[PDB]
Amino acid sequence: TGKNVNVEFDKGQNSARYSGVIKGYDYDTYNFQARKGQKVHVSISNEGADTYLFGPGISDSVDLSRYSSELDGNGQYTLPASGKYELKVLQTRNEARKNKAKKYSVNIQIK
Template sequence: MKFMLPMAALALLSPLASTAQASGVQKQVRFATGTTSGSYSGTVKSYDYDTYTFFARKGQQLHVNLSASDLQTALFNKQLPDSVSLDPYSPSLNKDGHYVLPYTGRYDLRILQTRNDARQGKTVPYQLKISIH
């Protein structure tokens, strides 16, 4: 006997499936020898997001400068209980606008749109500078 979902249930699940499969660019952050920062550019469209992956040590300070004010930044690490906003007025930043990394390991920085902008299908280009001291 096969288990089948009613059509109404499938209709409810389809928006979730489309947002769960958001794609975008994945880049490994690599700084030139002797430097502590790097610049990147990209474009975020609709529900897609770009991910910048880097490895850092506990206590290092991360600073993110994003040119597009209508985009958001979210930092992930497997030990963090939730993502951390790195937007300019985030309470997670210190007085110098830096985030002190709490763990040694891999971090993923995502560049994404607000849900409202994503629903409208906007395409937003950006310039990103990542510094780790």
């Protein structure tokens, strides 16, 4: 529940950048369709916000943040199935406690 943004790329691009404001425990969701074997890379401008991926072939979630052990050497994660994924942007639990609004910018690249 909360913001949903269907990720639409345009033209000849393989990435799109989005912005949001989330307060406390609220989260924003970015939906996209992808083919198994494609690689996703997500960057975020605010270290107080996590970026978690949900979808087919993923039992719980994948942490796509920059220091996540789930990324390869190029900062990418390989999507294990074809279908609809969700990237959620939420505050860390330690930050969420403060019930403050944070702005963020997220870049979503699917290759």
